[model samples]
Target chain A: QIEVGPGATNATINFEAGILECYERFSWQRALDYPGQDRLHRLKRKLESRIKTHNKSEPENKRMSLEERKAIGVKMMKVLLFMDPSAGIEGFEP
Target chain B: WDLTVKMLAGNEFQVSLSSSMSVSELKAQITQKIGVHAFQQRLAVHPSGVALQDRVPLASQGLGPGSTVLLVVDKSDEPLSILVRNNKGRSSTYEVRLTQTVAHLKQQVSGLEGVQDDLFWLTFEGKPLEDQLPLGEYGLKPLSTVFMNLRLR
Candidate 1:
């Protein structure tokens, strides 16, 4: 992280291992730009459909609740956030 | 003892804090007033060109009783470029220091072009600069300038 002192006369540059964690957490939302909007929307829709299909294929006793399905959808959204290329850190393998 | 601080762009304000205020805390307070994120800010001492560390004590730096510190926001960590022209109404070759990051050089170039924060692609030695690569670690010396040829594609 880079820090500036009072009066704006001097500046400092430092590296922090914690920044890597912060970047990873916010990585998913990094691509929140106009070009990625369509792709994100499509991914959300596909995940919702997949959840529905998965529920239908399960046995009646093992059927998932609506809340459980929504929870899974949220997780999928997080995954998509990291997966989108437009999130700024393009070609990020992880 | 509270100290008065000002932004580089000339906004003045008073910060009431103990003499024991840590350098990092003072930095956070300044950023709060200036509206620039602290994580993206850089502070350098005048004349010597030394970058301060976050843990450095503010009082130890002799800041008190109307003394002023210079703070600069390093917005150069982004893609940018510039054009240099000589007095003959022709373009002149500008050198870029090897120690300079692509982001910093981009800001210098952008200033020369009179453009504000527009994206421009850059290449060094026939290869694109990797964002993750540190210029200094690649055996590049400080003050060595690279001739950047800019064009609109």
Candidate 2:
């Protein structure tokens, strides 16, 4: 869970393709390095296992579709993408 | 039309194909010229070009004049070995077949890793792999590295 108190990123990706595209686009961006490298490593492993994850071939891994996985991958991506939170979004789950 | 036969090693061979000649002949020519097996060679017009099926016509395949034909290997062949890398940085190599689907290969790999068959997402060159698609179509060369990363839904 991310702390939305003051410095949280307001990045919102509402689709599956968006998350996948974002993940690969920023996969190697040094600027997007998360606060914890070790945590990112573990999360990458966790993602590697997700059936609802990126470009999965099995097609029936989970109840959630890749779109749903997109929500999750974004939830994970916000942690990795290095964007300035100087702008406020419409809403945050807190 | 004339086509350039590309190899994964960044080298290429120029081969002339008459419309009457079968694509199989080109396969043999690639094998004879570059020491790559006929079955292992995958000829594409470009990096993302459509792969030409064996025994098909080059004209029908629409290959030529551009990147010509790029060479890739059928990742799931006898000479093509899959190297599975684990979390600990250790890697292991295994043999697979072009005929075997990702699901079948997963079961084989699952037994080796002692995990559920579907839990693993086979990655080719660090990309997630599909189950239904033949491993050869992925343009994987022999001795390719497949990572067995631990992930969950």
Candidate 3:
């Protein structure tokens, strides 16, 4: 799953469905009653997988199935590793 | 682990190293055994085409089992021959002038492999090469080679 939550009306049919959806729709808001860390983490992973869905600069976030994005991400990470010689890939932006 | 070293010249040899040594240590060993520079080794293991980081360990990088590691030299002021390999397994070699533009080089190669369109764009490691840019500006020196993985659009 690479932690990609259900979006695009793909309903989560499980015991945690209700709470999961709450997390799925959460965002990075600065409201006093903003979504807590739990909800925020879900959004981040979703956003990461979403942006990762397409690395090329155009069309940006192309939607795809869960497994497909996973494959691409794993492969992209392998190739992207070479561009960073410092080995501190965690801080690299590209 | 027992490792096979492949040179840009198509020469091959084997060396042995334990998993504990740092990549710099490995590079030094290679230079000591052979005549290549220690700091310039851009080692890559195939079946993945992903080059190993010189700062990392061989075992940590999945080179634990028997592996074939390419030792691409860090070069300068020498006759630099760059090799471009496409997706269909076809390759072309060019003894390029260091200041040659990638665009001009492509013109020489665009028909060598007989592939159409711009799918034949060159790449260094995994990064795309800018055609209008000079080769020396791209960290390329003598004895360096750029790779191109070709596929039909």
Rank by DockQ (best first): 2, 1, 3
Model 1, span B1-153: residue lDDT tens: 566654444544665555777667766776566654454556654434466666767677666545455565543232222334322334434455434556665566567655442455445445555443345323334333343444455
- Among all windows of 10 consecutive residues in model 2 chain A, the one with the lowest summed lDDT is A6-15
Q: What's the ranking of the predictions by TM-score, best on top?
A: 2, 3, 1
Question: What value does the lDDT take at residue A33 in candidate 3?
Answer: 48
Q: Is candidate 1 or candidate 3 better by lDDT?
A: 3
Task: Report the poorest 10 consecutive residues by lDDT, candidate 1 chain A.
Answer: A9-18
Cα-based TM-score, every candidate: 0.28, 0.33, 0.31
What DockQ results do all the predictions give, each relative to the true complex? 0.01, 0.01, 0.01
- lDDT scores for all predictions? 0.47, 0.58, 0.55
DockQ of 1: 0.01
Write one digit per residue (lDDT tens) for candidate 3, span A1-94: 3333333122121112323333443433433244466565664466455444433432444444444333433333333345321222111111
Residue lDDT tens for model 2, B1-92? 56687664466678766766677787767656765556566567666677787667666677644336777654223445777777667788
Encode model 3's per-residue lDDT on B84-138: one tens digit a residue.
7666665667888656677877776776767553766777866888876657546
Q: Which pairs of residues clash in candidate 2, taking residues 3 or more apart in a chain or in different chains?
A: A49-B151
Evaluate model 2 with DockQ and give the value. Answer: 0.01
Candidate 3 clash pair list: B87-B150
- List ranges where model 3 is wrong by over 4 Å: A1-94, B77-153
